[PDB]
Ligand binder design. Structure first.
Ligand SMILES: N[C@H]1[C@@H](Oc2ccc([N+](=O)[O-])cc2)O[C@H](CO)[C@H](O)[C@@H]1O
Ligand SMILES: [Cl-]
Ligand SMILES: [Co+2]
Ligand SMILES: [Mn+2]
Ligand SMILES: [Zn+2]
Length: 654
């Protein structure tokens, strides 16, 4: 029993009750997965494994979620529970590497109580000493837990992570595991946010990636659908898997912005006031504008500390003693230096001591005990700066967000927004909201982001919009409404660079990403094809260093180039490597300063993706020196010494 799709083969063994995944390479298949068991319900703390094969049906010419392709339908039965399971797999003639899966269960004579449903599990075939993993969960830890994680098979430890999306976790419902020969991505196939896990677990000699959803009581003689997923077999690293997921999710209407519609100002070099913390003033910001303009900056953020309270989002009298005319004086001055102006806010937060909470508590989320619910930190808990959550289904809550947008753009003259410092959305029990279930608030969080953005666009189609779920992967269902992504308070060069690759995969190769400004890492920002940003008030040699790198970034402009993620594999090619094509020229960046993956010794550098018949001169564009005078495209290999980074371009020579 087998079905085929572009780039993928799926086989079922009825004796085994197992599934094996294959990927096409050249003229032959490569086996991506070990034979893997079908996902089952969990009852009384145990997954049910009494299921027996009933039938397998294969259709060769059919049309499914992804359009025309193939389908395999497997029916199984459990005598102890009375459950009949229907497991459907679909492939696509067009979409590369992708398998769609859906599961339903039918109960017999008695009700079945299920705590959790496991959808699909794939254990990787052919692993040796290490497996690399992409982990999209929103449960934290914040900031200091890497999104990309090495699973070492030679050590004492056993890697295990749930990768949650729930009332305390709002990130990306995807996980990937990969080796030199490639990997398997699993992601939630839903147009809207729902509770799901994508666990990654080390096994005895490998690792497995899976997906699962919350249980329910299944009534006697009833049929219910429990969950649907996308799997992607791929060569290379997590970029290829995540790109597959992006392509799949288009079919469900989750479509990221096309290059032609992204505004010019969302590719601009930016300086933010956060360097001064809460002690910025209008005149301090204005005083920097001449030097910022001359050095090449084209965008300014007014960061945190401008407002009275969240929800109200009114001007703080100490910062704006003359009211709205002071805000206009700031944005006018920014505009006079040829720049756009952005404003910091925290969407979903209606404050605690706000006028909004005092006058309209009915707009807010209510907990099970009848108290106002605080916005959660990742994994649960709260933060003193986080206020009460606005309910996304209360019309007045949404209106408060829209009114803020209209005031900031039309009364104060701002050109865009930096959303920040917010994560998931608590469950709502307010009976006056008439919720279908308490999770409905969590599910509909992204409506705040959508309605806000639509209001922004109506004022100015070139408006800038960003959201930072700081220290975690960004809320996936916010992404359609963005013009730029930040790597989100990265705590290392490893974090910022690898996340650039992940976001490019999910959003498109021309989608704007910034490496952020938590630490000074100008070479990381340029070489990844990211937008270089800064927040500090600099002097002396550090000022010279910022000017230098503004000049380089403004010369090569790799933030506007086509990111290329399919040539090198993070953790398997000799160096951590990034590639961008700009104005018909290939730019490469090699790094050694990331402690998570860095070679012993001094391996040769290989330039991939050049024309085999052409000859190239290799130039270090930072230092303006030739590192290799003439390389053929089919054998572009050289050795050069560098301590942290090497940024080069391949110049065609006649
Ligand atoms: N990433 C944001 C963000 O950074 C933080 C700071 C603290 C916390 N926190 O205490 O969870 C989270 C994100 O807010 C800061 C302002 O308060 C700045 O605007 C940064 O650029
Ligand atoms: Cl990371
Ligand atoms: Co942030
Ligand atoms: Mn281990
Ligand atoms: Zn509500």
């Amino acid at each position: 029993y087998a079905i085929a799709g572009n780039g993928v083969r799926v086989t079922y063994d009825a004796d085994g009750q197992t599934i094996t995944l294959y990927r096409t390479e050249g003229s032959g298949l490569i086996q991506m997965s070990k034979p893997s068991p079908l996902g089952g319900p969990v009852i009384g703390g145990q997954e049910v494994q009494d299921f027996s094969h009933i039938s397998c049906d294969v259709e060769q010419s059919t049309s499914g979620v992804m359009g025309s392709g193939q389908r395999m339908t497997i029916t199984s039965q459990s005598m102890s529970t009375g459950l009949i399971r229907t497991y459907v797999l679909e492939t696509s003639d067009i979409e590369e590497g992708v398998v769609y899966t859906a599961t339903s269960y039918e109960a017999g004579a008695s009700d079945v109580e299920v705590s959790w449903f496991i959808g699909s599990v794939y254990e990787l075939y052919g692993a040796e000493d290490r497996i690399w993993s992409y982990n999209g969960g929103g449960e934290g830890p914040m900031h200091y837990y890497d999104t990309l994680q090495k699973i070492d098979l030679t050590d004492s430890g056993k890697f295990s992570r749930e990768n949650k999306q729930d009332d305390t976790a709002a990130s990306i419902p995807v996980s990937d595991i990969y080796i030199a020969d490639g990997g398997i991505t699993v992601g939630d196939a839903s147009a809207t946010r729902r509770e799901v896990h994508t666990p990654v677990q080390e096994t005895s000699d490998s690792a497995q990636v899976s997906i699962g959803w919350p249980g329910k009581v299944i009534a006697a003689g009833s049929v219910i659908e429990i969950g649907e997923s996308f799997a992607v077999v791929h060569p290379g690293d997590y970029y290829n898997g995540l790109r597959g997921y992006k392509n799949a999710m288009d079919h469900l209407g989750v479509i990221m912005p096309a290059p032609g519609d992204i505004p010019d100002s969302s590719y601009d070099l930016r300086w933010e006031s956060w360097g001064w913390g809460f002690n910025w003033t209008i005149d301090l910001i204005i005083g920097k504008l001449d030097e910022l303009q001359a050095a090449g900056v084209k965008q300014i953020t007014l960061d945190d500390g401008w407002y009275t309270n969240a929800g109200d989002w009114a001007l703080n009298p100490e910062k704006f003693p003359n009211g709205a005319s002071d805000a206009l004086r700031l944005t006018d001055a920014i505009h006079e230096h040829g720049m756009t102006a952005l404003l910091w806010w925290r969407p979903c937060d209606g404050g605690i001591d706000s006028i909004l909470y005092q006058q309209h508590p009915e707009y807010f989320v209510m907990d099970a005990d009848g108290r106002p619910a605080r916005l959660p930190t990742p994994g649960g808990g709260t933060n003193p700066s986080l206020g009460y959550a606005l309910c996304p289904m209360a019309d007045g809550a949404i209106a408060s967000q829209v009114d803020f947008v209209n005031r900031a753009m039309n009364d104060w003259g701002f050109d865009g927004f930096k959303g920040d410092y917010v994560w998931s959305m608590p469950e709502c029990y307010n009976p006056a909201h008439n919720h279908a279930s308490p999770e409905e608030s969590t599910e509909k969080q992204s409506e705040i982001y959508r309605v806000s953005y639509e209001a922004m666009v109506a004022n100015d189609p070139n408006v800038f919009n960003l959201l930072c779920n700081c220290g975690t992967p960004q809320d996936y269902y916010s992404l359609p409404y963005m013009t730029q992504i930040a790597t989100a308070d990265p705590t290392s060069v490893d974090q910022t660079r690898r996340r650039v690759k992940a976001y490019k995969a999910l959003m498109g190769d021309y989608f704007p990403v910034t490496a952020d400004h938590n630490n000074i890492w100008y070479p990381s920002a340029v070489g990844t094809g990211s937008v270089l940003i800064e927040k500090r008030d600099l002097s002396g040699t550090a000022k010279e260093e910022y000017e230098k790198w503004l000049g380089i970034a403004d010369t090569v402009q790799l933030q506007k180039g086509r990111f290329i993620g399919d040539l090198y594999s993070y953790g398997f090619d000799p160096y951590e490597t990034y590639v961008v094509a700009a104005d018909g020229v290939m730019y490469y960046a090699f790094y050694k300063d990331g402690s998570k993956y860095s070679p012993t010794g001094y391996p040769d550098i290989e330039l991939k993706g050049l024309d085999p018949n052409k000859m190239y001169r290799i130039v270090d564009y930072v230092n303006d020196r030739v590192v290799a005078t003439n390389l053929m495209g089919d054998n572009a290999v050289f050795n050069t010494r560098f301590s942290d980074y090497l940024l080069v371009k391949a110049v065609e020579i006649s």
